Amino acid sequence: GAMAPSYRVKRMDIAKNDEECVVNAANPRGLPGDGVCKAVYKKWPESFKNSATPVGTAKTVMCGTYPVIHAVGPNFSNYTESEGDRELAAAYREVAKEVTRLGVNSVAIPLLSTGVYSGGKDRLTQSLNHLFTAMDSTDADVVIYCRDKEWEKKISEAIQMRT
Numbered sequence: 282g283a284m285a286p287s288y289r290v291k292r293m294d295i296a297k298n299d300e301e302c303v304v305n306a307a308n309p310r311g312l313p314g315d316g317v318c319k320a321v322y323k324k325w326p327e328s329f330k331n332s333a334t335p336v337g338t339a340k341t342v343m344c345g346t347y348p349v350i351h352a353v354g355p356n357f358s359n360y361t362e363s364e365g366d367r368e369l370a371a372a373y374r375e376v377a378k379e380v381t382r383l384g385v386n387s388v389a390i391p392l393l394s395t396g397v398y399s400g401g402k403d404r405l406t407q408s409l410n411h412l413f414t415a416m417d418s419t420d421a422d423v424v425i426y427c428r429d430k431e432w433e434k435k436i437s438e439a440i441q442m443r444t
């Protein structure tokens with residue numbers, strides 16, 4: 282575990298992370314995809330061997346010895362708000378199980394279902410709160426990776442408000 286488990290946020294490409302493993306915002310079919318998923322495919326293409334997994338699950342595939350945790354958030358274009366919210370919570374619970382199983386001291390994680398799976402809604406708070414619900418009982422250092430400068434400030438504020 283980390284000596285003093287923390288949350289941090291950085292505004293940069295998660296393919297350049299400084300953590301012991303990465304969470305991919307994957308699609309259910311193990312396809313290269315776009316956004317975080319395409320960056321992850323470029324950096325760790327070997328981790329897409331048999332990475333297909335259903336919505337609300339996570340499946341880990343090693344790229345060398347570096348673990349890529351493929352976490353499949355719901356696409357809110359297809360799910361109801363209620364069912365989508367349940368599957369988004371479940372994907373992060375499966376990430377916490379994998380992070381624990383791997384024995385890593387740190388993990389790089391994007392906000393699931395906030396980009397092309399958001400169904401055109403701002404889900405920063407919904408996705409981040411489900412991330413915290415899952416990860417709070419883990420002792421890994423968590424580093425959240427984002428793109429938007431306003432999102433960086435809001436995630437940083439949310440982390441600080443609990444400390």
Ligand SMILES: CN(C)C(=O)Cn1ncc2ccccc21
Pocket residue numbers: 292293294295320427428429
């Ligand atoms: C400037 N460049 C090369 C990019 O926009 C690449 N990139 N990809 C993800 C990401 C997150 C924050 C900042 C830059 C990011």
Ligand SMILES: [Cl-]
Pocket residue numbers: 306393394395396397398399
């Ligand atoms: Cl997304």
Ligand SMILES: [Cl-]
Pocket residue numbers: 427428429432
């Ligand atoms: Cl963002």
